[PDB]
A paper describes a structure:
Competitive ELISA testing RoAb13 binding against a synthetic peptide corresponding to the entire N-terminal domain of human CCR5 (hCCR51–31; see Section 2 for the full sequence), as well as against a panel of truncated peptides spanning smaller regions within this domain, showed that the core linear epitope (the minimal sequence required for recognition) spanned the sequence between Pro8 and Asn13, i.e. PIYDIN. Further truncation of the first isoleucine and the last asparagine of this sequence completely inhibited binding, whereas truncation of the initial proline inhibited it to an extent. The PIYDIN core peptide bound at the same location but with slightly less well formed electron density. It must be noted, however, that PIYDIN (residues 8–13) is only the core epitope for RoAb13 and not generally.
C-C chemokine receptor 5 (CCR5), a G-protein-coupled seven-transmembrane protein, is one of the main entry co-receptors for HIV and blocking it can prevent infection. Two X-ray crystallographic studies are presented of the antibody RoAb13, which binds to the peptide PIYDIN, which is part of the N-terminal domain of CCR5. We have demonstrated that the monoclonal antibody RoAb13 binds both native CCR5 and a free peptide corresponding to a short sequence of the CCR5 N-terminal domain, and that binding to the receptor blocks HIV replication.
Author numbering:
A (entry chain H): 1 to 132, 139 to 224
B (entry chain A): 290 to 295
C (entry chain L): 1 to 153, 160 to 220
């Protein structure tokens, strides 16, 4: 009933600029004092900025001058404008709402938007379907996409268990990412199973239907 | 010859 | 610039036991004027935001189970887990909100240790489409096993790998395998095999095939 939704993350080259947007619904917005927290690639959490019930801003030293935190009570939105991004600032960005009508305690949390800062180029992904008596398995491969992240779903998300999606692996600016899914042999190819993949900010959206390889040489 | 899906 | 310290680094527990967390601080988060400890605990299930577990070093946030209790004061705080479940397989963090900057600790990963399981494998040739662009990569899939301590394998000039963090449901791990290659070099050989070597697998577990083009 308290929802925080980040927006507008992605990739910038160094020294660039990004304005994040956290959209809040489900409470008296002006009554609480909010903040932002980032999580390093090494999974370390760092506080960033905080903005009081009365716009007193508070920043961690590493971002002073570059980052400006700003709230608009009218539309229930919070912003973190990030100028002159250093290679350190590559991290996942959460907004937080105050615990109560009080200080900046990280009571509630957004889902997190990711900011990647290399100089590298936005590249859409390729999708390669892993097609191969008890139970069969099939997979989906995403060789070469940047920046992170992507969203892999099975049959438009209708496939719940049996999925073991794996963390991406950057080698030479191109993330490689697999996923496994298992059903009884009685299921595939009896019922169509498709890899669904989205890569943001490349604005691509791909679905590669898992089909049996078929015996054709010449 | 798609040697046997599985 | 108060420095938080959480110890130890790793861990190993089993469902039902007790768990003790240790947050060391570089200053007193206790203020004489209100006798309040400005400290909070967090639980971050992998792939999600953290949740606020404990605050004022003791008070349970609403909806927090009873099997979580916060104690300690001043500079050395403690998180209490009465009965560890598997819905608590994650990491844990402590923070202070005395002064700025707000600070977190190094965290503590509890790797549950339940039972040695049997790693299911599944080997996959390159797709009839990847070869058509340039390149090829076999994949084999380890699924639903414990422990995380199992390496797998004969020319190995460039592969990639990927592990899942532990499943919050069945306490398992799982492994990927990016056996990347050149397209034409994939025809220079015929017999293609992965193989695992577990803690319960003295005699390894194998999955194999021959190049479908011969």
């Amino acid at each position: 009933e308290v929802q925080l939704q980040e927006s507008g993350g992605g990739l910038v080259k160094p020294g660039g600029s990004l304005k994040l947007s956290c959209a809040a619904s489900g409470f008296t917005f002006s009554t609480y004092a909010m903040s932002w927290v980032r999580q390093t690639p090494e999974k370390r959490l760092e506080w960033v900025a905080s903005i009081s019930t009365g716009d007193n801003t508070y920043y961690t030293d590493s971002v002073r001058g570059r980052f400006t935190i700003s709230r608009d009570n009218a539309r229930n939105i919070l912003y973190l404008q990030m100028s002159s991004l250093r290679s350190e600032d590559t991290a996942m960005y959460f907004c937080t709402r105050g615990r109560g009508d009080r200080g900046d305690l990280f009571g509630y949390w957004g889902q997190g938007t990711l900011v990647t800062v290399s100089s590298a180029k936005t590249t859409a992904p390729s999708v390669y379907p892993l097609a191969p008596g008890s139970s069969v398995t099939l997979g989906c491969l995403v060789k070469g996409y940047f920046p992170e992240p992507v969203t892999l779903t099975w049959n438009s998300g209708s496939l719940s268990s049996g999925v073991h999606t794996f963390p991406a692996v950057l080698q030479s600016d191109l993330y490689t990412l697999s996923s496994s899914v298992t059903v009884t042999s009685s299921t595939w190819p009896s019922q169509s199973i498709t890899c669904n993949v989205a890569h943001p900010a490349s604005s691509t959206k791909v679905d590669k239907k898992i089909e049996p390889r078929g015996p054709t040489i010449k | 010859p798609i040697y046997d899906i599985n | 610039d108060i420095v938080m310290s959480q110890s130890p680094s790793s861990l190993a527990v089993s469902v039902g036991e007790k768990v003790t967390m240790s947050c060391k601080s570089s200053q007193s988060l206790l203020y004489r004027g209100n006798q309040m400890n400005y400290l909070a605990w967090y639980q971050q299930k992998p792939g999600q935001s953290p949740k606020l577990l404990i605050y004022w070093a003791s008070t349970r946030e609403s909806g927090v189970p009873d099997r979580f209790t916060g104690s300690g004061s001043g500079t050395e705080f403690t998180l209490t887990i009465s009965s560890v479940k598997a819905e608590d397989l994650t990491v844990y963090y402590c923070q202070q909100y005395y002064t700025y900057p707000r600070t977190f600790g190094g965290g503590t990963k509890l790797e549950i240790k339940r039972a040695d399981a049997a790693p299911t494998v599944s080997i996959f040739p390159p797709s009839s489409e990847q070869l058509t662009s340039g390149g090829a990569s076999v994949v084999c899939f380890l699924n639903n096993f414990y422990p995380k301590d199992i390496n797998v394998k004969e020319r190995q000039n460039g592969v990639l790998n990927s592990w899942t963090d532990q499943d919050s449901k069945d306490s398992t791990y799982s492994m990927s395998s990016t056996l990347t290659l050149t397209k034409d070099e994939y025809e220079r050989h015929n017999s293609y095999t992965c193989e695992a070597t577990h803690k319960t697998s003295t005699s390894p577990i194998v999955k194999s095939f021959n190049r479908g083009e011969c």
